[PDB]
Subunit: 83 residues, 2 copies
Amino acid sequence: MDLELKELQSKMKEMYFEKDSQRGIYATFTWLVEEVGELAEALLSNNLDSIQEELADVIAWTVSIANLEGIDIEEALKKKYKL
Amino acid sequence: MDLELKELQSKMKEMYFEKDSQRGIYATFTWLVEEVGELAEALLSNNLDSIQEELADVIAWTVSIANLEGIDIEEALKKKYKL
Ligand SMILES: [Li+]
Ligand SMILES: [Li+]
């Protein structure tokens, strides 16, 4: 029931890695930025529904980059932060 | 051992919410953007060590915004994505 980081990462890879691989790293980063912009819009509008959606999208595209780069996000977090 | 999203979020709130609250939502978003820029630099340099660090930092600041906005990131993800 409680989603693990490792499961988030592996499930996203199964869904999106083929497409992300095809487009390449810089275009995938450009999508991340597009979604960071949508998060900006959501915060500026103070629309919690939008904020909720764009937070999910920003995480999802950050995970995409982790998957393209072969980096475990859980261990990246634990290396840098006290977790 | 396997870090849950809910634990990531709650632990980050304990560490950083007071400081993030003090600075406010738009300055906190500005820090997120600063780290997205560092991720850009890391990708451009193809330095995996840097990429690993900045991915962690981008997630961490995205979680900061979720905490400031009172949004559960796990449920945000599950609402938008098949997880
Ligand atoms: Li979005
Ligand atoms: Li950073």
